[PDB]
Amino acid sequence: FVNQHLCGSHLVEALYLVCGERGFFYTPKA
Amino acid sequence: GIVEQCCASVCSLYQLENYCN
Ligand SMILES: [Cu+2]
């Protein structure tokens, strides 16, 4: 696998692919 | 955090696994 530059919605897509049915939390900074 | 690192820098799929439930 390779390193990733992922901003905005592209990071959400990556988390979805990585976690699948386990689900995930998307937790940006304040 | 990860949202920030992945965008301002880079991150790996293995680092993202840390956010799965
Ligand atoms: Cu885009």
Q: How many folded domains does chain A comprise?
A: 1
HSE (side-chain half, CA atoms, 13 Å) at B15: 16
In chain A, what residues touch B1 (CB-CB under 8 Å)? 27-29
- Residue range(s) defining the domain that contains residue A8: 1-30
CA A12/CA B13 separation, integer angstroms: 12
CB contact residues (below 8 A), chain A span 1-30, against chain B: 1-8, 11, 14-15, 18-19, 22-29
Alpha-carbon torsion B20, B5, B8, A5, what sign? negative
Structure resolution, Å: 1.5
CA B16/CA B3 separation, integer angstroms: 9
**What single DSSP character describes residue A20?**
G
Inter-chain CB proximity A19 and B12 less than 8 Å: no
In chain B, what residues touch A25 (CB-CB under 8 Å)? 19, 21
CB pairs A-B closer than 8 Å: 63
Alpha-carbon torsion A13, B7, B1, B15, what sign? positive
CA B8/CA B6 separation, integer angstroms: 6
